[PDB]
Design an enzyme around this catalytic site. Structure first.
Site, short mmCIF file in Angstrom:
data_model
loop_
_atom_site.label_atom_id
_atom_site.label_comp_id
_atom_site.label_asym_id
_atom_site.label_seq_id
_atom_site.Cartn_x
_atom_site.Cartn_y
_atom_site.Cartn_z
N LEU A 1 0.83 -1.20 0.00
CA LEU A 1 0.00 0.00 0.00
C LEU A 1 0.87 1.26 0.00
CD1 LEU A 1 -2.40 -1.47 2.59
CD2 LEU A 1 -3.25 -0.53 0.44
N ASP B 1 4.08 8.63 18.33
CA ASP B 1 3.96 8.97 16.92
C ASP B 1 2.50 9.16 16.48
OD1 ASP B 1 5.16 9.55 14.46
OD2 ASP B 1 5.85 7.48 14.05
N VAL C 1 4.07 -1.15 4.52
CA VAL C 1 2.85 -1.89 4.88
C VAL C 1 2.22 -2.52 3.62
CG1 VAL C 1 2.55 -0.25 6.80
CG2 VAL C 1 0.91 -0.26 4.90
#
Ligand SMILES: CN1C(=O)N[C@H](Cc2c[nH]c3c(Cl)cccc23)C1=O
Length: 253
Positions: free
Chosen positions: A16, A116, A18
């Site tokens: 994508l 994050d 990942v």
């Protein structure tokens, strides 16, 4: 419990790093691709089980391949959803804010500081419900060993000695709040990484006047409180929820 998966249980993958993967039984899943402590850290992260948190369903620990397998959210990340036709009504935005607060309060209750938090780590399903993810493995120690600064608390900018705290996530949330209403990443006028860092450390914040779409005065006051330079002046996620939840139920449904 965590499921030890084999790459033979998958039919094919598409990036994508990942990737969307098709399992032969459980359907669609997301795959992100020290041998002994890696599976104990997987067991630890598998305990994060909440409706607003992307679950780690399993791990692939094979000769050459080491992957984390998570639950799939058919619409992608928050920023991609916000930019795809800006129809997203105020009541849906308020619901997304409330779901992010709930997921962050759950994570901090389990002793997990995200570090994050950003729209890229807020994943969306077909009904516009969200789950918090950690796709860069910021909360991992063993697995992580094998435009990103827009959401970083000023205490961590140019200071790697600073221990991340629960208040570091509150600052990231404040910038996420601004992005949800602006339908875009902050600091479009910034010219250089060094100038942006120094401007933020000196008090600069995303442009509150750069929100063309209506944003209630109460939500602007909330983001200004959450992005305070002093971490001690920022409220906690249950403190944010105690003021946001009654506003949402009486003004946004
Ligand atoms: C990478 N990854 C996720 O995004 N979700 C699972 C579980 C998980 C680990 N840490 C997380 C944080 Cl900090 C937030 C949400 C889910 C998690 C996972 O392993």
């Amino acid at each position: 419990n965590v499921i030890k998966m084999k790459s033979s249980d998958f039919l094919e993958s598409a990036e994508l790093k990942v990737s969307l993967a098709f399992h032969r039984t459980q359907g669609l899943m997301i795959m992100k691709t020290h041998n002994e402590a890696l599976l104990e850290e997987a067991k630890m992260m598998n305990r994060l089980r909440h409706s607003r948190v992307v679950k780690l369903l399993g791990v692939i620990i094979e000769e050459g391949k080491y992957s984390l397998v998570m639950e799939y959210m058919e619409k992608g990340n928050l920023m991609h959803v916000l930019k795809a036709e800006m129809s997203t009504p105020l009541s849906v935005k308020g619901r997304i804010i409330l779901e992010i607060i709930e997921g962050m309060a759950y994570l901090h209750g389990k002793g997990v500081i995200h570090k994050d938090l950003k729209p890229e780590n807020i994943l969306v399903d077909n009904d516009f419900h969200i789950k918090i993810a950690d796709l860069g493995l910021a909360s991992f120690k063993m697995w992580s060993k094998l435009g990103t600064l827009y959401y970083m608390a000023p205490e961590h900018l140019n200071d790697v000695n600073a221990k991340p705290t629960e208040k570091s996530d509150v600052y990231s949330f404040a910038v996420v709040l601004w992005a949800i209403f602006a339908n875009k990443e902050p600091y479009e006028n910034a010219i250089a990484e060094q100038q942006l860092i120094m401007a933020i450390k000196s008090g600069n914040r995303p442009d509150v006047d750069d929100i063309t779409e209506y944003c209630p005065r109460e939500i602007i006051s909330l983001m200004k409180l959450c992005w305070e330079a002093n971490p001690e002046a920022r409220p906690t996620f249950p403190g944010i929820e105690e003021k946001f939840r009654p506003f949402y139920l009486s003004q946004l449904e």
